[PDB]
Amino acid sequence: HINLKVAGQDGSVVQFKIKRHTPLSKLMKAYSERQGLSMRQIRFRFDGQPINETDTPAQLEMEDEDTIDVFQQQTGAVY
Amino acid sequence: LCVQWKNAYALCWLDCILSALVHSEELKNTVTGLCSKEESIFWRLLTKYNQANTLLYTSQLTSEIFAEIETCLNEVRDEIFISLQPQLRCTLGDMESPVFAFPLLLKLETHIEKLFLYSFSWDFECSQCGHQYQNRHMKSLVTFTNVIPEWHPLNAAHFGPCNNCNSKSQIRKMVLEKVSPIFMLHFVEGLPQNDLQHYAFHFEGCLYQITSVIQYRANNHFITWILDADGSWLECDDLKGPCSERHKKFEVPASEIHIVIWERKI
Ligand SMILES: [Zn+2]
């Protein structure tokens, strides 16, 4: 059980609590709901690296009060 | 007369970075003055690109030359991809973001990263509840969204919410402190207008001018635009063969201007 900040590119910061071995999927979904964003439309990053719905804070070595960055998805290139 | 990478699966997110790098004057001059040049992935990148480019000039033996150009360019692109793969956890077919990959690539070599690292503070005050902060950072690529109509590097403000009272459309401002020889920003919705000369600026006596732009075309394809010496522009679209396309003016719609690269000038 730790606190995680989700920091958006407009300067918003929302804090959540989560257990170390719980998948980040439930957090990414909760954040989408709070902000009205589609989950397929955003991308999360921790320590400069993209993170998955299946990752847990334990796997990523997240300490309490760590920050996850969130971006509108702007990926390429289609083929 | 300007060779470029051909598309391979989803790799336009990498291609646009590589084209930006090999056309940067300040990167070139630093790389040639490195101790232990050969050990540098950026030395290898610029050296292999230059050999492919020289081959292309030779071209104007055809099948052999274009085979050598492809193998040469593909080898150094693959080396850089494999260097980034543990951190992006990506396959060749995965769509990725140059906004994520560019800082990670630079971090591989501190002597190159230093060219790009600038210091600034984010300044914020809420007109409704008084919440305020000033947070100092050193970064190589900062992201802007919802910029003010008159956005400028010397007045680099955008709209955003208050984290204390949730009031919308407060002002958050990047206040530059020390600018690196190469200065890059990411714009989620592009720039308010596409006349790039307006965004030139002086900082502590030095002139910065935009020298390249990464375009996010149709929200699915990254294309690099390079400013040439005579003022014309080179478009490096990896879907259009080995040579790049010369344009007289700069033709990216303002809303598709994704990453903007300024460089310090004499
Ligand atoms: Zn407020």
Numbering used by the authors:
A (entry chain C): 17 to 95
B (entry chain A): 225 to 284, 296 to 501
What's the paper's own text on this?
Proteolytic activity towards ubiquitin-modified substrates is common to all USP family members except for USPL1, which shows a unique preference for the ubiquitin-like modifier SUMO. Full-length of USPL1 is composed of 1.092 residues containing a USP-like catalytic domain in a middle region and long, disordered protein extensions without the presence of evident globular domains. USPL1 is a low-abundant component of the CBs that plays a role in the RNAPII transcription of snRNA that is essential for cell growth.
In order to get insights into the interaction of USPL1 with SUMO, here we show the crystal structure of the complex between human USPL1 and the human precursor of SUMO2 at 1.8 Å resolution. The complex between USPL1 and SUMO2 was prepared by taking advantage of the formation of a covalent bond between the SUMO2 C-terminal glycine (Gly93) and the active site cysteine of USPL1 (Cys236), which stabilizes the complex, increases the binding affinity and thus the chances of crystallization. The electron density maps clearly show the covalent bond formed between DHA93 in SUMO2 and Cys236 in USPL1, in which the sidechain and not the C-terminal carboxylate is crosslinked to Cys236 Sγ. The final electron density map model of the USPL1 catalytic domain includes most of the residues (Ser225 to Ile501), with the only disruption of a disordered loop connecting two alpha helices in the thumb subdomain (Leu285 to Lys295). USPL1 adopts the typical fold of the catalytic domain of the USP family, resembling the shape of a right-hand containing palm, fingers, and thumb subdomains. SUMO2 is grabbed by the USPL1-like right hand in the complex, with the C-terminal tail of the SUMO2 precursor extended towards the catalytic triad of the USPL1 active site formed by Cys236, His456, and Asp472. Interestingly, a major difference in USPL1 is the lack of two loops in the palm subdomain, namely so-called blocking loops, between strands β6 and β7, and between β8 and β9 next to the catalytic triad. Arg324 is engaged in a strong well-oriented electrostatic interaction with Asp71 of SUMO2, with 2.7 and 3.1 Å distances between the NH1 and NH2 of the Arg324 guanidinium group and the OD1 and OD2 of the Asp71 carboxylate group, respectively.
